[PDB]
Symmetry: D2
């Protein structure tokens, strides 16, 4: 019955969704192109559109989709800052998402970035691979005993905090809604500025909203402990990357791990190595020995993908039965 | 200025030891060469020799050292499988070590290898560096819920077990002397073969002895779960690397992280990139997308190095006060 | 509106062929799969099949193609060792090729491999990229004055010779046939074993036939000048790659540049980086600092591709008109 | 009755320097001291008491350095290099400090390297190597072009530029040339002299082989890049300051410049010849140049061949012996 058009489709998306669809028999169409004003016409006549985090679901796109017959927007993601939710509501277009496919996948990836940066595992790998077994510049630091500041102690942030507590770190936390689980781990809540000044490692797990946009700016970087590590597996626009470059150059910021980037939408998820990279700031970030960028793969585990696909297909079935689930606000 | 000769010296060694020697004023000499039968003559007239894990302290070397006037052997390491302890004892040469400079350094490195392999971070890095933001082949797996088998639950193995429990892993353990802290974490002890057959990830933290040599061989790899991950931050000779190659090629072994290698002694710690690598087995291990080798750097953190230098210099001061500590015995 | 089925099609092939002005109203179909016994059925009802150098055109494949209605085999290549020519002839299936799309493209690539190996440019690139501006191991040698031995002085060999003469190299040559252009360049013909013993650099440009198969074997490697450079942009089976590995490890062979490899057929032209590489010998060749392998891209220039497409489309038109051109004969 | 004292301090010394110079010194027995640091105002004191100082291309031999060296007893400055833009020759002369150099150790070593950069860029050999090393045997993005038939413009047809031109003519390239002082050997070769702007507009590949002087400084600037053929290749094995690298970045990003090979960089002096991989790179412009797939940078190694090194060492030790006997050779003058 039901027909679903997926934008920004990759092979991992079709594999996982085709496996999960043995339980549903929806008719699945995978389109590679990003959703934007000039591709929305591809969804003409599709009742359901399945979008990912760098699809453009601003007002003009939503208007096109609604006018073309689309009646549900299914986000195969937890995040939803790319959707104009007020406009969806005005158009009577429900928006559904997958709020907790695997908080562990994302938290673990953040911990992986930390360790790769700390022990210079990315540099080591390239050395041993060519028969360079020298260790200059690879000396790391013990995680045990360090102060780890978590900004945003929700599903992912809390899971990240628990892992880091298991390394014997001292947890510092900031959230407008503190939670008791963090305290039970030994964490202590404090104000943002104090967290920044006291943390050896900071990790961002708050959503992107008007209040978190450029939360990490020049001013705030200058507050941080010299040589600190910053991890961003949240959203690119949580940080001002031009300011990160200056702090990296001065040594003020010791390490940076990114799984997201502010201008990632038209570059991530494809191989653009054959052409010059246009984004000056990203190119410069990539040049540093103490920066690691992964291309928005913190979600990318077998279990995460299976849960995304199962929950998304269930969301759609629930909507089709008139009892929708996992709606976004 | 008591005189200490350091073999296999690297810049990080002379830097850390020099900083720590502000509190002692020993006279420190750093030799780059490895200690072996051929190089032992360099220690003539040195009362104290400081060696590392790839120096050869077998009987013939210890005999030369003793004949040349050396009276103490200070290991700037926790491990001591490179020392013939019976022969040291017969010669009246005490051997001292640093047993617990930082169990966390080594455990954390093992967990780093696990995550790099899992999320293919070493491959991702190289891709994004050149503007390849594609994700094919990089899908990993949640650590939460997996079974992690720890072989050797001592200072490092236990610290590793604790970290992995914090990711929500199910801990399985094998040690001739089980310890209660592991059970308090939720770990369950079992026999070696059962641990191998049931684990998704296996990590080696037992010392190298005649009983652990080639513990992971062809037969034991075949009993492991298909696609499992094996981590070796112990010693090279705990595994048979030729058998690892065959299991990697078949897919039987899904991942391998090594910080040690059986024939590392004359290879590691130096940049040999300008010449062909002679060792066929290491070259082949290095060829795989699901193998990561680090060059015996699990011990290499600021805190580990400072503790190694401080404890080693203190060990030597204690010896020279007639109250030796951190001795290793036959 | 004759239809053409292309096997082993890559994006650069379909772009190339579609952008030609020489379509002659043909209908072009591009299949990615390699031609072999179990894919030949895809050509059922196609009058013309276009194949590349790693397609299987042995007798059983040719029999299927003829039984399925294919009447012409068009090689988008110069080389034809992959074709059983006697069997094609017995089936009345003409085979056409492109013998001289661009001898310069291929010769220039060989020269590129030479310079890369000499100046260690592949190593330098990765160093500078990460801010390593050190030069240890990168010292090269002046080409000017060196002896360059060319095995096979045909279209590509003589173009290569000509380029190497322009660097002021001394040219040595071996071919069953004299070529007066080689003498005009200053080249001297000599016997194979003498060429091998006297040359600083050797480059292979003979076709693969039963007489050139494994021309470079253990015994002939041992005759070469110690530390010499060997370049192979001919065909993989001209050399014995297991013997190349031993000579590289001993230092007897100083450098190796390959654009071709004996078991390339099912490996080259794809990205196989996500899985272990099965071929031990290729994995080991890839491990060396003084080996460069490119994946059969010597033909791969803008001008070469355009000529291959134009000449191949013309060859097919000329066959259709009953005046065939560029036939290869048993 | 037959021959059977002299102390030399080398700045910016590397292992390949002490090895080559020690081999050549079997013929002399001078006393050789190798210092790693770069020569500049605050390291000049290390040459106190040394009659001879041997410097390389990134040592600072401006007036204030030369004044310290002279005051400290140094009597000869021996450049282990062909180039000399780093020396204030008028100041050396005013101080009575002769400066000697090695003008032609191996013009082939440098020309050949430039050709290597061309071919690596053209066939993407650097990209292919990293692919095949990890089992990626795909060829997308690696299509090159035939050199045969292309136009190659040589700016500066001296020893190196002429050797380069001859090599490129052997590939069947058409040679275009610009030099304020044309020479007949290039024409005899089939090369055609023309004005700079016309060379820039007509060339598929341009290679710089002029010295750095006040007239060649930023010779390749934004305006001259905009004159070039779209998608052209530029090669710089001359000096860093011959080009404006910020403008090269904009032309690379637009596609106006198709390829860039550098063996030299304007701010190289305090970074090249060292492994600086363990720290951030401070220079924004170099970091960005390094990011591109169609840029290759080698760290000033065009001179670096066995034969070049042996000639530099032999000629440099000979220049010092000749000076010591009062009959100096290979002097450079203001
Ligand atoms: N890189 C990746 O692949 C993925 C990234 N993400 C990002 O992670 C974010 C977090 O996801 P969850 O933890 O699941 O969400 P959640 O809703 O469980 O938790 C978010 C937390 O952030 C806090 N928060 C809100 N505003 C804040 C502010 N101004 N300052 C500090 N904290 C604030 C909330 O109070 C809440 O505790 C998502 O918004 C998404 O952008 C999510 C999934 C994958
Ligand atoms: N990669 C690196 O840089 C470093 C490696 N190591 C290695 O790790 C090893 C372990 O270190 P620690 O935890 O400090 O030692 P430990 O002595 O504290 O603990 C070792 C554990 O191994 C167990 N064990 C002994 N024999 C066994 C057997 N046959 N089978 C299974 N388990 C057995 C012991 O009962 C003990 O619980 C060292 O012996 C050394 O080789 C140590 C430091 C650094
Ligand atoms: N890497 C690549 O992409 C390419 C490789 N090739 C290979 O290069 C080969 C050469 O092609 P061309 O120069 O065009 O061919 P060609 O036919 O013009 O010249 C071949 C020469 O090799 C000589 N030769 C034949 N048998 C010989 C033997 N037994 N020993 C020594 N020399 C012998 C012939 O006398 C002739 O002079 C092709 O057969 C092909 O395999 C060709 C094009 C591209
Ligand atoms: N990358 C490297 O490792 C090396 C670089 N070089 C550089 O290459 C340069 C060339 O050296 P050689 O060819 O031996 O010098 P050379 O003196 O023989 O020739 C230089 C040529 O440039 C020409 N020229 C002078 N002023 C010019 C101007 N304003 N515009 C255009 N052309 C002009 C000259 O007339 C002469 O024909 C050296 O000055 C040096 O900076 C030299 C050696 C090694």
């Amino acid at each position: 019955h039901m027909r679903i058009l997926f934008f920004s489709s990759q092979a991992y998306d079709s594999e996982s969704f085709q496996a999960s669809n043995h339980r549903h028999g929806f008719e699945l169409h995978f389109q590679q192109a990003h959703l934007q004003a000039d591709t929305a016409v591809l969804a003409q006549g599709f009742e359901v559109v399945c979008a990912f985090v760098n699809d453009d679901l601003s007002r003009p796109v939503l208007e096109r989709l609604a006018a073309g017959g689309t009646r549900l927007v299914a986000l195969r993601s937890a995040g939803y800052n790319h959707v104009d939710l007020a406009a969806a509501e005005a158009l009577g277009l429900p928006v559904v998402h997958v709020p907790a496919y695997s908080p562990h996948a994302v938290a673990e990836h953040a911990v992986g970035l930390i360790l790769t940066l700390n022990r210079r595992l990315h540099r080591a790998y390239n050395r041993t691979r060519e028969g360079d077994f020298s260790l200059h510049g690879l000396t790391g630091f013990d995680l045990h005993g360090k102060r780890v500041g978590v900004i945003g102690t929700g599903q992912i942030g809390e899971t990240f905090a628990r892992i880091m507590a298991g390394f014997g770190c001292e947890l510092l936390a900031y959230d407008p809604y503190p939670n008791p689980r963090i305290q039970a781990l030994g964490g202590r809540y404090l104000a943002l500025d104090a967290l920044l000044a006291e943390s050896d490692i900071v990790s961002l797990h708050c959503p992107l909203t008007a209040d978190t946009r450029h939360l990490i700016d020049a001013q705030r970087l200058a507050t941080m402990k010299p040589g600190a590590m910053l991890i961003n597996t949240g959203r690119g626009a949580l940080v001002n990357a031009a300011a990160l470059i200056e702090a990296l150059k001065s040594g003020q910021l010791g390490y940076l791990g990114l799984d997201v980037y502010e201008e990632e939408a038209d570059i991530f998820f494809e191989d653009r190595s054959d052409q010059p990279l246009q984004d000056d700031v990203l190119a410069r970030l990539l040049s540093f020995p103490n920066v690691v960028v992964t291309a928005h793969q913190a979600f990318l585990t077998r279990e995460a993908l299976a849960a995304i696909a199962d929950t998304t297909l269930d969301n759609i079935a629930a909507w089709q039965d008139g009892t929708p689930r996992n709606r976004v606000r």
